[PDB]
């Protein structure tokens, strides 16, 4: 997949407010193909529907947390390469290590600025040649 207007994003967080921030930032950046999920299970249901090129995900969520979500994606043959940007209040170095080692494409700590989201997305786009 490529970082063009068509790139389809999945935004995952148990709080509407945080999903709404991310969706609106993505709109500003020119990405209007954006769906939302409320937890890891919900996310996987939509991912399995097909077509997604990018996941932005919270950590602390009911039913399936974001670290489990990330691990599932990375271990699944059909989506193991999917970009996953963690966007979370979890700020301990050991959280960052766990997510990094699990295969996070990037990691943004809440609260975050519009500029921070943009540059961390762009960093992932460049790393993956999108
Ligand atoms: F709930 Be998240 F991890 F910010
Ligand atoms: Mn949460």
6 CA distance to ligand 1 centroid (A)?
27
Backbone CA torsion sign across 80, 84, 88, 94 = positive
Tell me the technique behind this structure: X-ray
The torsion defined by the Cα of 34, 40, 45 and 46, in degrees rounded to 10, comes to 10
What angle do helix axes 66-75 and 40-49 make, rounded to 10 degrees? 30
- Ligand 1 neighbourhood includes 60 CB (under 6 angstroms): yes
In whole angstroms, give the CA distance from residue 66 to residue 40. 6
In whole angstroms, give the CA distance from residue 62 to residue 97. 22
Residues of the chain with a following break (C to N over 2.5 Å): none
59 CA distance to ligand 2 centroid (A)?
6
- Ligand 1 neighbourhood includes 110 CB (under 6 angstroms): yes
97 CA distance to ligand 2 centroid (A)?
19
- Ligand 1 neighbourhood includes 95 CB (under 6 angstroms): no
b (16+ CB within 10 A) / e for 66-100: bbbbbbbbeeeeebeebbbbbbbebeeeebbebbe
* Structural domains in the chain plus CATH codes: 1-130 (3.40.50.2300)
In whole angstroms, give the CA distance from residue 21 to residue 112. 10
SS (H, E, C) the chain: CCCCCCCCEEEECCCHHHHHHHHHHHHHCCCCCEEEECCHHHHHHHHHHCCCCEEEECCCCCCCCHHHHHHHHHHCCCCCCCCEEEEECCCCHHHHHHHHHHCCCEEEECCCCHHHHHHHHHHHHHHHCC
What number of other Cβ atoms are within 10 A of residue 40's Cβ?
26
Question: Ligand nearest 90 Cα, by number?
Answer: 1
102 CA distance to ligand 1 centroid (A)?
17
Q: Does residue 130 have a cis peptide bond before it, meaning omega lies within 30 degrees of 0?
A: no
Of 28, 18, 68, 16, nearest to 44 by C-alpha is: 68
Do 30 and 6 touch, CB atoms closer than 8 A? no
Of 54, 91, 84, 81, nearest to 69 by C-alpha is: 84
Of 4, 1, 2, 55, nearest to 32 by C-alpha is: 4
- Mutation test of ligand 1: which of 86, 90, 117 has the most ligand atoms closer than 8 Å to its C-beta? 90
Do 6 and 26 touch, CB atoms closer than 8 A? no
């Amino acid at each position: 997949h490529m970082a063009d207007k068509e790139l389809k994003f999945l935004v995952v967080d148990d709080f509407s407010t945080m999903r709404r921030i991310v969706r609106n930032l993505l709109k500003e950046l020119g990405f209007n193909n954006v769906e939302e999920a409320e937890d890891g299970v919900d996310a996987l249901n939509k991912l399995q529907a097909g077509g997604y090129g990018f996941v932005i995900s919270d950590w602390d969520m009911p039913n399936m947390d974001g670290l489990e979500l990330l691990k599932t994606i990375r271990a699944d043959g059909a989506m193991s390469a999917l970009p996953v940007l963690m966007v979370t209040a979890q700020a301990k170095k050991e959280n960052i290590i766990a997510a990094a080692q699990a295969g996070a494409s990037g990691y943004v700590v809440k609260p975050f600025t519009a500029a921070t989201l943009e540059e961390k997305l762009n960093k992932i786009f460049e790393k993956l040649g999108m």
